[model samples]
Target: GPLGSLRKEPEIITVTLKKQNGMGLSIVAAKGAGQDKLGIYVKSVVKGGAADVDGRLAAGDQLLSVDGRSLVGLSQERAAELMTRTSSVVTLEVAKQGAIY
Candidate 1:
């Protein structure tokens, strides 16, 4: 399928965010057609939010891990749950679109 055909090695990214008022970064899952692998992608960065102010997180970056837990092969709902239950100081590993290793 087209989605599977566009597969690329994920790049590693690290960002630290300080949770404020129970809000952090917003993320979503990305899966291509015919691909069994699951990818966590950043949907948006809230303006003036923890992630947004950090200046590392961006929209469209594929999330690799939350804290030290890897998100690969996990369901979208499960991944979102993991993110929401992260530490006050969250560390995210992500891959931006067209990112080089």
Candidate 2:
């Protein structure tokens, strides 16, 4: 009877890859969250998931687009909603410590 604290798996939000330029694909674009620089960030990537599959998507890739649309002022939740509207496989263009696979 040790099924007491079943930790629900964290929700995985797959993003679509629109574009990339030497940096990883954009996941979430914010105006001031990262200091008004119009930057992107990965909302969350599961430990052993698709993102981890290609060894590209991680926890902190700068989000640049959604469905080929720039994520300039979209909230994380909004971005997620977009993902929900699309296929389960969300392609994401990302930038990592090294060249993303």
Candidate 3:
């Protein structure tokens, strides 16, 4: 039956990208009305940028972590700071539609 169909576990994907001249991917952060929780998500991938060329991250993908550091509830300001401090090569964990990429 449709209700009993088997389902695969959500896939967790890891992506490595190299930043060029301090430019990375375009991302956005959102939170609830009360600002209780904050989640950083990819808004767009700049053309020819690290993330765009990597072809892993896409708009609407929630950024789970950067360099193995979780970004949940992190402020947008600090998030940018952390990203800038990372090496040229960066690893990202992203999630979308219950699956991680």
Candidate 4:
């Protein structure tokens, strides 16, 4: 009974950062790999940038939502367009284990 406790679940981190010029958070699309969903991932961080200050974000981390924009399922081009609108305070969430609902 003790061993059959709650099943493990991935944790998500919330990040709301405001930038001076740009978000300073680079992102890219990843091919829908086996058992994976088409999602956008953080490519890298610009040193001393807004995202850099958070320190919780990292490369290869997939985004769940940003500024109320659903990042999953959207192709790189289109996803880029959504984010292209851009928010001063980049409100985004990053997944710790995987990408899905």
Best-performing candidate as measured by TM-score: 3
Note each model's CA RMSD in angstroms.
Answer: 6.0, 15.2, 7.5, 7.9
lDDT tens string, model 4, 1-101?
01111122422444444554555667777445543446567778765556666665557656665556656544566666655666555554455444343
lDDT tens readout by residue for model 1, 1-101:
11222245544444444545333457676445647656667777665656666665657767666556666545567676776666555565566667545
Stretches > 4 Å off in candidate 2: 1-38, 96-101
Stretches > 4 Å off in candidate 1 = 1-16, 30-34, 99-101
Q: Better model by lDDT, 1 or 4?
A: 1
Error of 2 at 100 (Å): 8.0
Cα lDDT for residue 35, candidate 2? 51
Backbone clashes in model 1, listed as residue pairs = none
lDDT of each: 0.58, 0.46, 0.58, 0.55
What TM-score does structure 3 among the candidates reach?
A: 0.65
TM-score ranking from best to worst?
3, 1, 4, 2
Tens-place lDDT digits, model 3, residues 26-86: 7788445667558677788665656676665557656566666666545567677767766
RMSD of 3: 7.5
Error (Å) of candidate 3 at residue 43 is 0.9
